[PDB]
Design an enzyme around this catalytic site. Structure first.
Site, PDB file in Angstrom:
ATOM      1  N   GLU A   1       0.794  -1.228   0.000  1.00 42.85           N
ATOM      2  CA  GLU A   1       0.000   0.000   0.000  1.00 42.85           C
ATOM      3  C   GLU A   1       0.836   1.291   0.000  1.00 42.85           C
ATOM      4  O   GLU A   1       0.555   2.225   0.757  1.00 42.85           O
ATOM      5  CB  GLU A   1      -0.980  -0.003   1.191  1.00 42.85           C
ATOM      6  CG  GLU A   1      -1.912  -1.206   1.192  1.00 42.85           C
ATOM      7  CD  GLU A   1      -2.860  -1.262   2.380  1.00 42.85           C
ATOM      8  OE1 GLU A   1      -2.887  -0.307   3.185  1.00 42.85           O
ATOM      9  OE2 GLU A   1      -3.594  -2.271   2.492  1.00 42.85           O
TER      10      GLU A   1
ATOM     11  N   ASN B   1       2.361  -5.016  -3.173  1.00 44.14           N
ATOM     12  CA  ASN B   1       0.940  -5.296  -2.990  1.00 44.14           C
ATOM     13  C   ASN B   1       0.171  -3.987  -2.788  1.00 44.14           C
ATOM     14  O   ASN B   1       0.655  -3.081  -2.106  1.00 44.14           O
ATOM     15  CB  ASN B   1       0.774  -6.198  -1.760  1.00 44.14           C
ATOM     16  CG  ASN B   1      -0.592  -6.850  -1.675  1.00 44.14           C
ATOM     17  OD1 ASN B   1      -1.066  -7.459  -2.636  1.00 44.14           O
ATOM     18  ND2 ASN B   1      -1.241  -6.727  -0.509  1.00 44.14           N
TER      19      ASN B   1
ATOM     20  N   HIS C   1     -10.263  -5.693  -2.790  1.00 42.84           N
ATOM     21  CA  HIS C   1     -11.344  -5.488  -1.841  1.00 42.84           C
ATOM     22  C   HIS C   1     -12.467  -4.739  -2.556  1.00 42.84           C
ATOM     23  O   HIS C   1     -12.455  -3.508  -2.643  1.00 42.84           O
ATOM     24  CB  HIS C   1     -10.839  -4.718  -0.623  1.00 42.84           C
ATOM     25  CG  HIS C   1      -9.820  -5.471   0.176  1.00 42.84           C
ATOM     26  ND1 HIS C   1     -10.123  -6.629   0.862  1.00 42.84           N
ATOM     27  CD2 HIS C   1      -8.504  -5.235   0.392  1.00 42.84           C
ATOM     28  CE1 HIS C   1      -9.036  -7.073   1.471  1.00 42.84           C
ATOM     29  NE2 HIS C   1      -8.039  -6.246   1.201  1.00 42.84           N
TER      30      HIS C   1
ATOM     31  N   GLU D   1      -6.078 -10.469  -1.675  1.00 38.74           N
ATOM     32  CA  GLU D   1      -6.900 -10.283  -0.476  1.00 38.74           C
ATOM     33  C   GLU D   1      -8.375 -10.191  -0.842  1.00 38.74           C
ATOM     34  O   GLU D   1      -9.103  -9.335  -0.344  1.00 38.74           O
ATOM     35  CB  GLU D   1      -6.473  -9.014   0.280  1.00 38.74           C
ATOM     36  CG  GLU D   1      -4.952  -8.876   0.476  1.00 38.74           C
ATOM     37  CD  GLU D   1      -4.557  -7.741   1.390  1.00 38.74           C
ATOM     38  OE1 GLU D   1      -5.455  -7.067   1.933  1.00 38.74           O
ATOM     39  OE2 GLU D   1      -3.340  -7.529   1.573  1.00 38.74           O
TER      40      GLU D   1
ATOM     41  N   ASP E   1     -12.136 -10.013  -1.385  1.00 45.39           N
ATOM     42  CA  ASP E   1     -13.454 -10.119  -0.782  1.00 45.39           C
ATOM     43  C   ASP E   1     -14.363  -9.123  -1.489  1.00 45.39           C
ATOM     44  O   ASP E   1     -13.890  -8.148  -2.087  1.00 45.39           O
ATOM     45  CB  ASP E   1     -13.442  -9.954   0.752  1.00 45.39           C
ATOM     46  CG  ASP E   1     -12.677  -8.728   1.224  1.00 45.39           C
ATOM     47  OD1 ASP E   1     -12.777  -7.662   0.576  1.00 45.39           O
ATOM     48  OD2 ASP E   1     -11.985  -8.832   2.269  1.00 45.39           O
TER      49      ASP E   1
END
Ligand SMILES: [Cl-]
Ligand SMILES: [Cl-]
Ligand SMILES: [Cl-]
Ligand SMILES: [Cl-]
Length: 302
Positions: free
Chosen positions: A131, A172, A209, A237, A239
């Site tokens: 990030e 990432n 996300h 990650e 979702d």
């Protein structure tokens, strides 16, 4: 166990894994371990390898939970994504409080060397930096960028490489979900430059996300990321709010559409344990039964 393993099915398509975030608490309760054993092929420590978990107090290392996860993965034949070496969040106060660039330079090297070195040869890939971008593609403000500018990235990746020459080193980030989005463009530009300068960046991780409808952008975003001279991409990650079957299948089809994408990690197993629990965004419900999104993915991998 969901009956029909998405990891087994996705391997047959030529991908490396379908995996999940997990850690010791999860592994030791309810159906988490059994599901990973039956249905998945890869694990990421949800928190146990973050710097605040490992070394909240300077010089006092806390390896236990991280060691446990690595052992679980090895004993069950799951690959591991180390997560994550350099990140502005979940960071020890003592690191945040550093005021000198050279101090930080040497702290990064020591931390990266030590953590990667501990699991040398056991962890397939590392999120070396996490990030680091603003939404417009400029470098996020944090202790790392503030003191060292872009240099902290070179320092971290080079230290990771020498600590384990065989590990795939990833950068990432989240919101890499739409082609031509500012963050995607900025990441492509910087990672390309860093690679050209010899920085050993092997992979780009797209956290994914997503909200409802977000799956429609994943294909274009991965295709753009694939043009960067990294070797690998991964959805790291995953979702999605409300776990819509359409969005979940679109993300999987996107991965299948891009050669560089090696696999998918969802950010947890049961909705109950999600960091975004109020949005029921995962593939298993609170009872650990597969949801329609899981089954839909089975259907298209069939
Ligand atoms: Cl098989
Ligand atoms: Cl239990
Ligand atoms: Cl301290
Ligand atoms: Cl290999």
């Amino acid at each position: 166990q969901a009956s029909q393993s998405i990891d087994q099915l996705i391997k047959r398509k030529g991908k490396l894994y379908f995996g999940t975030a997990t850690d010791r608490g999860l592994l030791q309760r309810e159906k988490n371990a059994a599901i990973i054993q039956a249905d998945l092929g890869q694990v990421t420590p949800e928190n146990s390898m973050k710097w605040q978990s490992l070394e909240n107090n300077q010089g006092q290392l806390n390896w236990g939970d991280a060691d446990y996860l690595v052992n679980f993965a090895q004993q069950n034949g799951k690959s591991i994504r180390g997560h994550t070496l350099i990140w502005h969040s979940q960071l020890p106060a003592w690191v945040n409080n550093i005021n000198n660039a050279d101090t930080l330079r040497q702290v990064i090297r020591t931390h990266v060397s030590t953590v990667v070195g501990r699991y040398k040869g056991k962890i397939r890939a590392w999120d070396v930096v996490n990030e680091i971008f603003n939404e417009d593609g400029t470098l996020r403000s944090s202790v790392f960028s503030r003191l060292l500018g872009e240099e902290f990235v070179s320092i971290a990746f080079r230290a990771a490489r020498d600590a384990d020459p065989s590990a795939r080193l990833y950068i990432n980030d989240y919101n890499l979900d739409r082609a031509n989005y500012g963050k995607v463009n900025g990441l492509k530009t910087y990672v390309s430059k860093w690679i050209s300068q010899g920085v050993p960046i092997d992979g780009i991780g797209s956290q994914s996300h997503l909200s409802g409808g977000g799956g429609s952008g994943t294909l274009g975003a991965l295709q753009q990321l694939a043009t960067v001279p990294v070797t690998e991409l991964a959805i790291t990650e995953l979702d999605i709010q409300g776990a819509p079957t359409t969005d979940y299948t679109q993300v999987v089809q996107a991965c299948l559409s891009v050669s560089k994408c090696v696999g998918i990690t969802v950010w947890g197993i049961s909705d109950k344990d999600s960091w975004r629990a109020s949005t029921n965004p995962l593939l298993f419900d609170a009872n650990f039964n597969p949801k329609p999104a899981y089954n839909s993915i089975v259907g298209i991998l069939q």
